[PDB]
Amino acid sequence: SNTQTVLPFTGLNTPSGVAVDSAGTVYVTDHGNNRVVKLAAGSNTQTVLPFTGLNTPHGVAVDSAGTVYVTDHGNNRVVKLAAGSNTQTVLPFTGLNTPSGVAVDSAGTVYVTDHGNNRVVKLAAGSNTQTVLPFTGLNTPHGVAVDSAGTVYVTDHGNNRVVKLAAGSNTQTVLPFTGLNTPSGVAVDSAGTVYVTDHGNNRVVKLAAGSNTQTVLPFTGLNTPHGVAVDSAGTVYVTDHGNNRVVKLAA
């Protein structure tokens, strides 16, 4: 499409991550206000999720049960809130330094980019101990996404590239993006198309499934994109750091 919609969030200061659930509810981490806001589909009014003690959130993910998972930079931890709950759970990750992105697969496994430790960690549902994914030579990961097959996609700031690992594989794959500068967020649709916020080039890049054609999505007026999400219809949602807004573009 050639229509971008500014969603009616208010008062954002460095919106850092975005997620969209199956109902079309949009969740945004508002880094500079220590909060996560949500907007139900068609609603005019955001609500603030009742995380307690949250500081400087980066990433957000939502599972099919509606549980919301958030990374907290200032406390170096990951928290989750079940739908309808007022009492978060701190997940049993350990030793995080700048947890930057979070994703949750269909089995409830939680994947977190640990930016300051140059690694991606994962925690199975019910486990108390993370494992480190075998992403050789990873540096400063920002964003993570997991697809319905369990393939994990990660952006690497220091190396300006995007890598993936299939479930059960030891061989990572470097995706055929070109010309990235500070890839931040990543999202993947069920067709396999991969969307990346190319923060240092002020643009959002699409790698079309199959053809591997890279295009720039026709967002307008961005002042450095951070987070990205894509819904089942192919609508792409982006957080715009310098303009303190969240915008969407239909396919």
Q: Rounded distance, CA 26 to CA 222, Å?
A: 19
Residue 146 CB, nearest approach to Cu ion (Å): 20
Token pair, residue 34, equals 């220590």
Q: Rounded distance, CA 211 to CA 148, Å?
A: 20
- Residues 6 or more apart from 8 whose CB is under 8 A from it? 39, 44, 45, 46
Q: Which stretch binds Cu ion (CB under 5 A): 67-75, 104-112, 121-129, 230-238?
A: 67-75
Q: Which is nearer to Cu ion, 130 or 140 (CB)?
A: 140
Site string for Cu ion, 133-172 (x = CB under 5 A): -------x----------------x---------------
Q: Which is nearer to Cu ion, 163 or 193 (CB)?
A: 163
Residue 178 CB, nearest approach to Cu ion (Å): 20
Binding flag, residue 241, Cu ion (CB under 5 A): yes
- Looking only at residues 7 through 66 of this chain, which bind Cu ion when binding is defined by CB under 5 A? 56
Residue 212 CB, nearest approach to Cu ion (Å): 25
Binding flag, residue 77, Cu ion (CB under 5 A): no
Q: Which is nearer to Cu ion, 25 or 243 (CB)?
A: 243
Q: Which is nearer to Cu ion, 147 or 241 (CB)?
A: 241
Q: Rounded distance, CA 175 to CA 250, Å?
A: 24
E strands within 22-160? Answer: 26-30, 35-39, 47-48, 57-62, 68-72, 77-81, 89-90, 99-104, 110-114, 119-123, 131-132, 141-146, 152-156
Q: Which helix (H) or strand (E) holds 173?
A: strand 173-174
In the sheet that holds 47-48, the strands lie side by side as: 15-20, 26-30, 35-39, 47-48
Q: Which is nearer to Cu ion, 157 or 248 (CB)?
A: 157
Binding flag, residue 113, Cu ion (CB under 5 A): no
Residue 30 CB, nearest approach to Cu ion (Å): 11
- Looking only at residues 201 through 230 of this chain, which bind Cu ion when binding is defined by CB under 5 A? 224
Binding site for Cu ion (CB under 5 A): 56, 73, 140, 157, 224, 241
